[PDB]
Design a protein around this nucleic acid. Structure first.
Ligand SMILES: [Mg+2]
Ligand SMILES: [Mg+2]
Ligand SMILES: [Mg+2]
Lengths: 390, 549
DNA sequence: TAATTCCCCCCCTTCGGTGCTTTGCACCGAAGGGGGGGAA
């Protein structure tokens, strides 16, 4: 039993509970009934003013429901290393060590904050409230306490295959060993009984300019705007010697320039564009912000950075064509992929700026979530800056 | 008497004490109603007598119950509520009759004196002290303290609701075929058993409740349809709202309009086509609460239509789990939508409306998507599943919008229904410049101090114009400059602007907006058969923007 | 002259946060005000 205290001057989470579907409610009732049966949780009354949302998810190839409690506000007020070369491997694997926390009891003074409410269909009954007695799932304090035995329970497998650099975050283990696909499954199968992705192909998307011969006035204007906007990200863009070419009240489709010094300036800008922006160091103290844009037919572009125009990472997520009319599903999958990449590389879950209305996301994101953790997100409204990040 | 149920531990906020508010004088009629009530509850141990050892006090008063012959005793616990610790409410919403399945037998029960039958924490009772103001010899007044849950306390509802669930749990754990709708102390018991067995097991429920100290008086025990439950009349195969009376006034104040609008939002849950936007438009302006507002002609027709709708009797129907929910949406106009959720045609599970205007600039598609979201959330609340929609928008229009829009939008499975008027987009922005049309470089700028600006345009064919704007803004100067180009050009225009704000406002294809300038811009865009909008940065000396600026 | 509490819905108004248009507009989301509905 480790005494856990909140952040000095902070209070407990008091978040409401969103409505749930019939199947989710039934699964939650069954799960909470059984965990109360072996004493993982306990019923409480209204004298506890704290509350966190809860729901249920179906994980990959499991067909069984799993309880997901939104310990996002509790984590921010709890107040308690990364693998240096986890991305150096090529076949990192995700394991779900989530039932091992149910064996370490939670301290009595902290249980009141871990309270949740199950609703009912058609409000036939006041919601049933429970609180946790053991270390919960989704709480950023459970790994901090289980680590003292987590190290002792992997020490054996740590001296068996010394090529295994591992990580424990939230409720999942990221195991990375630079070996062939045949060995890795045997290594993973050995690990699971011992207790009983692609981190080397992530490439950034460099900023590019259009390639053509007939540069119309509109095309020159778009290229000049793109270069001016990218000048903030990449120091060196001058665009002066091209802006001096577009002179007059010409129409919006005239191709005047063709061959001048503008071609040399375009080549010079192209050459400096293919650099991995010197600097942009990852400070392990600032919050990670990931911004996502929709680029049409099933394509999304994400940028992870700490401060603007200094992109720590850039990438594109396509998944599949527009056959999935479900934009919410694609956005959820992209968010999960970006979060997994961030935990693999930096070890910190970012703060997302989702390009979606609040009501749509809050209504539909539970139907497709399949991860044990939850990132913090806000909602943007940036009408097209006219491509630019494509 | 009182229940043997365990008491919920209640404490005050740290560094706080109980109330010491002196009782205010009461009219002669209400003292005799209080000494009787206090005498009755004092014999049963509900309230005890105290002496000088307890310094706290709290005012009391009485209202008339819904029976209109018995008095309800209340305590003004506002101060104690301020110093009382916080509670989490367990009541999450109102049950709806449309979510009820057809049952062979139904009984509605009400617990008599619900709060007074639940004990209160001992170490808190002293904070509940009060005095009865006998108006005979001014003093002495008799002092009591509550031993049970008092009415007027903020923690009483939450404590009672969680205590009545623990009392019904042993009954429900052994009768899974019985459906019990519990709201406060009101119980709706439904079963598929025959009438005899249903009544026999109801008597078992009333014995179980009595064993826990909660009596169920026979005057509030309903056995025959129609059942008056939660403001609805429940027949064996249908449900209605209890009769709604609308005021018939020749002069309407602010409060009367506010009352009328509230009574129409309630009537809109089962009556179809109820429109309230015109009536609510008279409430804009913070015109006190007694100021008389004459009825405008636009707000009179809506009232006449709403009165016509309520003349006919409208019934609901019950839920059938086997079948699927179909929600149909109609556009009334001026950003108003109506919807009907049903399972059979012309047999509505429930009707509703949506008239919210989110954002300064919006169009029909966004409002339809928001209405779909609201209906989906409400259906998840009531029936636990998402219905299937019959939208008046064509698949082509939605495909174009969601492919071209820059934000992630999605609606659940739906089909198109040919119900005029149809949702559509009235104009589109060309993806490439138009060849053969004049190219307009527009720009505007307003001074920050005196709020005077200039907005104008220059054309490639030798046609420029500037109009100085008084009492304006930097962005609105750009909007006016863009509007200027549309006014004096042909049916095909190429337009080059400089502000990101105008880009973001225009390229979302708005149809209605809160500002008249954007409305005129939208009208001119509608009458324009081809428009192109392109943005260039500022102060870069770009060709074309210098002449206008 | 009556005076209370707790939930759900609606409409309208103020005000603070945020971001770009940059120290001042534009916009949006919480909180409050009234009103209905349900209960003590
Ligand atoms: Mg009663
Ligand atoms: Mg009752
Ligand atoms: Mg009643």
């Amino acid at each position: 039993t480790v005494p856990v205290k909140l952040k000095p001057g902070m209070d407990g989470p008091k978040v409401k509970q969103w409505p749930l579907t019939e199947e989710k409610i039934k699964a939650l009732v069954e799960i909470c009934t059984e965990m109360e049966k072996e004493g993982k949780i306990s019923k409480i009354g209204p004298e506890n003013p704290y509350n966190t949302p809860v729901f249920a998810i179906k994980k990959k190839d499991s067909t069984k429901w799993r309880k997901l409690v939104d310990f996002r506000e509790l984590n921010k007020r709890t107040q308690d290393p990364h693998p240096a070369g986890l991305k150096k491997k090529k076949s990192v694997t995700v394991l779900d060590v989530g039932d091992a926390y149910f064996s370490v009891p939670l301290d009595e003074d902290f249980r009141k904050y871990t309270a949740f409410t199950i609703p009912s269909i058609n409000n036939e009954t006041p919601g049933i409230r429970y609180q946790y007695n053991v270390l919960p799932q989704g709480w950023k304090g459970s790994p901090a306490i289980f680590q003292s035995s987590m190290t002792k329970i992997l020490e054996p497998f740590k001296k068996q295959n010394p090529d295994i650099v591992i990580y424990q975050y939230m409720d999942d283990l990221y195991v990375g060993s630079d070996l062939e696909i045949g060995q890795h499954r045997t290594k993973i199968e050995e690990l699971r009984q011992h207790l009983l992705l692609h981190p080397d192909k992530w490439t950034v998307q460099p900023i590019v300019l259009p390639e053509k011969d007939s540069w119309t006035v509109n095309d020159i204007q778009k290229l000049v705007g793109k270069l001016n906007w990218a000048s903030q990200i990449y120091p060196g863009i001058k665009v002066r010697q091209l802006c001096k070419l577009l002179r007059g009240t010409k129409a919006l489709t005239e191709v005047i320039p063709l061959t001048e010094e503008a071609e040399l300036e375009l080549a010079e800008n192209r050459e400096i564009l293919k650099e991995p922006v010197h600097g942009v160091y990852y400070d392990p103290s600032k919050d990670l912000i990931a911004e996502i844009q929709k680029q049409g037919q099933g394509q999304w572009t994400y940028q992870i950075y700490q401060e603007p125009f200094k992109n720590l990472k850039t990438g594109k997520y396509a998944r599949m064509r527009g056959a999935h009319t479900n934009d919410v599903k694609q956005l959820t999958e992209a968010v999960q992929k970006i979060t997994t990449e961030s935990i693999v590389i930096w070890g910190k879950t970012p703060k997302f700026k989702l390009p979606i209305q609040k009501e749509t996301w809050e209504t539909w994101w539970t139907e497709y979530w399949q991860a044990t953790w939850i990132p913090e997100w806000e909602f943007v409204n940036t009408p097209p800056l006219v491509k630019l990040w494509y | 008497p009182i229940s043997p149920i365990e008491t919920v531990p209640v404490k005050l906020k740290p560094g706080m004490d109980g109330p010491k508010v002196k009782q205010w004088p009461l009219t002669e009629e209400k003292i005799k109603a209080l000494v009787e009530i206090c005498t009755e509850m004092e014999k049963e141990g509900k309230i005890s007598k105290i002496g000088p050892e307890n310094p706290y006090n709290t005012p009391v008063f009485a209202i008339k119950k819904k029976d209109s012959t018995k008095w309800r005793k209340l305590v003004d616990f506002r101060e104690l509520n301020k110093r009382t610790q916080d509670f989490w409410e367990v009541q999450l919403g109102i049950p709806h009759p449309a979510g009820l399945k057809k049952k062979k037998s139904v009984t509605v029960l009400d617990v008599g004196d619900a709060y007074f039958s639940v004990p209160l924490d001992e170490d808190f009772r002293k904070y509940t002290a009060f005095t009865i103001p006998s108006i005979n010899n001014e003093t002495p007044g008799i002092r009591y303290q509550y031993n049970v849950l008092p009415q007027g306390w903020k923690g009483s509802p939450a404590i009672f609701q969680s205590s009545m669930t623990k009392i019904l749990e042993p009954f429900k754990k052994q009768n899974p075929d019985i459906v019990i709708y519990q709201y406060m102390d009101d119980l709706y018991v439904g079963s598929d058993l025959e009438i005899g067995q249903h009544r026999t097991k109801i008597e078992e429920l009333r014995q179980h409740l009595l064993r826990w100290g909660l009596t169920t008086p026979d005057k509030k025990h309903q056995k025959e349809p129609p059942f008056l439950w939660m403001g609805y009349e429940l027949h064996p195969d249908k449900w209605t709202v209890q009769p709604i009376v609308l005021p018939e006034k020749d002069s309407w104040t602010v409060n009367d309009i506010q009352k009328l609008v509230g009574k129409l939002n309630w009537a809109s849950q089962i009556y179809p086509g109820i429109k309230v936007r015109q009536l609510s438009k008279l409430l804009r302006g913070t015109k006190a609460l007694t100021e008389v507002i004459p009825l405008t002609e636009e707000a009179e027709l809506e009232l006449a239509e709403n009165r016509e709708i309520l003349k006919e009797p409208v019934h609901g129907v019950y839920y059938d789990p086997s079948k699927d929910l179909i929600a149909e949406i109609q556009k009334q106009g001026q950003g108003q939508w109506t919807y009907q959720i049903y399972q059979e045609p012309f047999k509505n599970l429930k009707t509703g409306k949506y008239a919210r205007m989110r954002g300064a600039h919006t169009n029909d598609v966004k409002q339809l998507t928001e209405a779909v979201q609201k209906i989906t959330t409400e259906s998840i609340v009531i029936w636990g599943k998402t219905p299937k929609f019959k939208l008046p928008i064509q698949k082509e229009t939605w495909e174009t919008w969601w492919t071209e829009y820059w934000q992630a939008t999605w609606i659940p499975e739906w089909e198109f229904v040919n119900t005029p008027p149809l949702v559509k987009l009235w104009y589109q922005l060309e993806k490439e410049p138009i060849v053969g049309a004049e190219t307009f470089y527009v720009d505007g700028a307003a001074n920050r101090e005196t709020k005077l600006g200039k907005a104008g345009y220059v054309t490639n064919k030798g046609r420029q114009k500037v109009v100085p704007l008084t009492n304006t803004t930097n962005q609105k100067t750009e909007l006016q400059a863009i509007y200027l180009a549309l006014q004096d050009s042909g049916l095909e225009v190429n337009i080059v602007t400089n502000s990101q704000y105008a880009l973001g406002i225009i390229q979302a294809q708005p149809d209605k907006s809160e500002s008249e300038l954007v409305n005129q811009i939208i009208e001119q865009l509608i009458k324009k058969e081809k428009v192109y909008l392109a943005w260039v940065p500022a102060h870069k000396g770009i060709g074309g923007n210098e002449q206008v600026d």
